[PDB]
Design a protein around this ligand. Structure first.
Ligand SMILES: COc1cc(C(=O)O)ccc1Oc1ccccc1
Ligand SMILES: COc1cc(C(=O)O)ccc1Oc1ccccc1
Lengths: 115, 115, 115, 115
């Protein structure tokens, strides 16, 4: 609810389906601990990663396995994965949508933070 | 239903609200005739532009008034507007979502064409 | 060189070579009058479109023939072209670099404006 | 120059000057070992990170300190940084240009890989 991920394919002009997404939370020893994961739906969205009670302020990394995605389509990719590292902040609005647009040699990611 | 437009603001990380959007259809004299328009909602989306019966194959231009949008926020923009010109094609899938990510000196546009 | 265009290929991770580019300048009647044209080089760059003396204040449109570029690669792209529209020199003479990153169903454009 | 980084500012339409860049190379243990570092110049480009002899096959991470760059401009950005992760030289020696386009809540990265 508080955190949603949406992936799109700029080569085929479609949602990016069954893309693996891992979210990590930065721990006090500065290592990344597993926090949430899932695979995008037919609409390229991944919902239900976390809840308001568990999504406390902190630094989060979301990993999008873009390489596996392009491999399964038979298209050489450049990147190992796409990356979005950010600070969740209770001051700001509290719904985070991380959207990624993927090409084999390029990606863009944007955050839409709303109520 | 067949044609949807979604605009996002990469400076504020939010949907781009009350953005004017004009769609034109290319006529046989190669001029652009008015086809549909509206303003994006609070969620940055613009729905109900056209229907399946009216959205025939042809070349369409969609105009996003990005300049007015940045002006009202007090931010100098570079572009007069953002532009997406494309051929609607009955062979391909038939729902078109045109998404635009806006920055003052840059924009990206992507088409997601589904069932 | 007051106006330079650089085009990259997001699918192949390379400059986009031999891409046709047409520039227009909006006249009184609000018709687009042919201004300058050329094709990108091996580096993806197009230099020599215009001169400081010829490139007066005005509203310019840079049309990048993205469709012919994807078609010669066997790809049926979404966009007919990428149009960049902007007011040039209106706060005085500037040097403009219009960069475009191309994918079959997506493109991004940015402007680097220096004094 | 086998590795070059270029950073642009989508808000100001200018190169992103003085942006810190750190490169790591994944070791056996799957830890990221410091590889090279520097800051972009007035042109937004960072040259001289490494040499042909030093830049062997491996998995590299290029971290661009986008947050410090937006903060010195008075902007509180979404991302902690922009990380680019890729396998280099695995089909033989290449020259790599990693380009990033920055906005406060968004970034795009592309790779131009030449032989
Ligand atoms: C919500 O976010 C996006 C949503 C959609 C859609 O909801 O079908 C498309 C693109 C979006 O993002 C992007 C637009 C341009 C570049 C990157 C993503
Ligand atoms: C070397 O590559 C780029 C170069 C320039 C420039 O030469 O001034 C601009 C954008 C570049 O890449 C980008 C293109 C679009 C989006 C992001 C970066």
């Amino acid at each position: 609810c508080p955190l949603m991920v949406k992936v799109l394919d700029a080569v085929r002009g479609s949602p990016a389906i069954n893309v693996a997404v891992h979210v990590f939370r930065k721990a006090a020893d500065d290592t990344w601990e597993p926090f949430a994961s899932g695979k995008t739906s037919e609409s390229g969205e991944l919902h239900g990663l976390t809840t308001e009670e568990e999504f406390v302020e902190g630094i989060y990394k979301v990993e999008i396995d873009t390489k596996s995605y392009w491999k399964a389509l038979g298209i050489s990719p450049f990147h190992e994965h796409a990356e979005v590292v950010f600070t969740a902040n209770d001051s700001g609005p509290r719904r985070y949508t991380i959207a990624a647009l993927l090409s084999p040699y390029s990606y863009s990611t944007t955050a839409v933070v709303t109520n």
